């Protein structure tokens, strides 16, 4: 009966074997990214890695836009990443027409998590090999970040990260919050928040990136946009001048 490990069923150890391998699929691409909560907004950064020169830098992105008020960043292989991307855009449209006004961040992370829980419980569907991370600015609780696990468990984070080096990156964001005893960056301007997360990423990875080596998403209140090559390079200019 060696087929017990090939699907999702109760194991003799009381665990799930296929769920344990779902988290391991996100480390195949080896893409490190993090997200922090600003004062009035939220800024997310990601490492842009282009293996071949034949790839168009504008087409390759790990940050997808679900709606005008909500951004998204996903780690792991792109096919499972864009599979849940179009599923999240459909849930945001059904919520506007049927239910009411635009969807907030927590509802999108909860509906996509419950959708993966049905796929995990049912044995004829394999779980997604990626991790859904949604960033937006709510009109009630303000800036919030919800990271949806492939197992279907969503929980809020102050400053999150992703990748195999996440445990080394989390230490950087954790030690900063212990000394200041603050749960968010007190900088009001969103420009200083962009250069804030980039500074901690360079010192943690020990690598100075370029305009094409990073993709910085910016989620403001009721607006979301992705910084271009000139906007990302402009942030790296003031970083070398100050520090």
């Amino acid at each position: 009966a060696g087929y017990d490990r090939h699907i999702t069923i109760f194991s003799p150890e009381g665990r799930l074997y296929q769920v344990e391998y779902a988290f391991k699929a996100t480390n195949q691409t080896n893409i490190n990214s993090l997200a922090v909560r600003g004062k009035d907004c939220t800024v997310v950064i990601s490492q842009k890695k282009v293996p071949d020169k034949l790839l168009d830098p504008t087409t390759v992105s790990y940050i997808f836009c679900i709606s005008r008020t909500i951004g998204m960043v996903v780690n792991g292989p792109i096919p499972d990443a864009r599979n849940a991307a179009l599923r999240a855009k459909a849930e945001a449209a059904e919520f506007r027409y049927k239910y009411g006004y635009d969807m907030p961040c927590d509802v999108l992370a909860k509906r996509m998590a419950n959708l993966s829980q049905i796929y995990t419980q049912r044995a004829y569907m394999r779980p997604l090999g990626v991790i859904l991370t949604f960033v937006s600015v709510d009109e009630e609780l303000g800036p919030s970040i919800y990271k949806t696990d492939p197992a279907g468990y969503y929980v809020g984070y102050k400053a999150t990260a992703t990748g195999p080096k996440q445990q080394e990156i989390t230490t950087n964001l954790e030690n900063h919050f212990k000394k200041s005893k603050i749960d968010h960056i007190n900088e009001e301007s969103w420009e200083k928040v962009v250069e804030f997360a980039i500074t901690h990423m360079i010192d943690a990875l020990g690598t100075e990136f370029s305009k094409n080596d990073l993709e910085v998403g910016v989620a403001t209140k009721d607006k979301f946009f992705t910084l271009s090559a000139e906007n990302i390079e402009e942030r790296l200019v003031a970083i070398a001048e100050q520090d």
Binding site: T8, I9, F10, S11, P12, E13, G14, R15, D106, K110, A113, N114, Q117, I118, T120, Q121, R122, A123, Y124, M125, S144, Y146, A151, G152, Y153, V155, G156, Y157, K158, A159, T160, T170, L173, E174, F177
Partner: protein, 250 residues
């Protein structure tokens, strides 16, 4: 086409039991331990919040949900399928009662509907049984305050007080001598704190412990005035500051 698996994943073992529900109970002890205590003035249930990351927010994580305004629920472990069961429980509770009888179902009838969803996963094919164990506690106009234990195998049993989880062995035994016939709501809270404190090996505070109590009908939690019939919901969620007030009370 769609799915080609129509058979049930749960089969009868040669030992005379079901292999899926046997390992389902084992997975309940693989995670955080919850508990609850029933008294004469109300039912007090408690749990612990285990943060996977030190930067996680415990306010966004709610381990005690609300099915009906008079009945709460609490699970053990991470509860992967807990969100699926609650979403399906709130629909069948309002459709079969609120949309038919016009009122919310009592505690004994609600736990029968919650177990009705879990008992189908052990038989109907294409799905696997639920590896979570809930606790149905509430108040009605006949049975009064009652607490039911929901097993992952699909069966429910009434219990005065119980604790299920990783520390279910020691915590359940300690509640035998700490419970009697005459108890109050606030007096039962100290019973839950003394038992849960011994099971917490990590940080002990009010943010990592979610204490849900069912008291009388509160007009402040209702939201409207002028109707003497409805005095508000009995179930109440204590804030972070109110829980820490009773932690140092020991």
């Amino acid at each position: 086409m769609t799915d080609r698996y129509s058979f049930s994943l749960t089969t009868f073992s040669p030992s005379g039991k079901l292999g899926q529900i046997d390992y389902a109970l084992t997975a309940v002890k693989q995670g955080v331990t919850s508990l609850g205590i029933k008294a004469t003035n109300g039912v007090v249930i408690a749990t612990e919040k285990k943060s996977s990351s030190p930067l996680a927010m415990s306010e966004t994580l709610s381990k005690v949900s609300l099915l009906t305004p008079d009945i709460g629920a609490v699970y053990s472990g991470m509860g992967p399928d807990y969100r699926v069961l609650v979403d399906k429980s709130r629909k069948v509770a309002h459709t079969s009662y609120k949309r038919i009888y016009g009122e919310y179902p009592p505690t004994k009838l609600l736990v029968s509907e919650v177990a009705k969803i879990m008992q189908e996963a052990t038989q109907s094919g294409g799905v696997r049984p639920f590896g979570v164990s809930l606790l149905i506690a509430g108040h009605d106009e006949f049975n009064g305050f009652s607490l039911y234990q929901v097993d992952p195998s699909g069966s429910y049993f009434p219990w005065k007080a119980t604790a299920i989880g990783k520390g279910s062995v020691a915590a359940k035994t300690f509640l035998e001598k700490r419970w009697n016939d005459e108890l109050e709501l606030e007096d039962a809270i100290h019973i839950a704190l003394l038992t849960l404190k011994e099971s917490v090996e990590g940080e002990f505070n009010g943010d990592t412990i979610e204490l849900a109590i069912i008291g009388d009908e509160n007009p402040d939690l209702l939201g409207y005035t002028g109707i003497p019939t409805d005095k508000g919901p009995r179930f109440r969620k204590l804030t972070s500051q109110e829980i820490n007030d009773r932690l140092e009370a020991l």
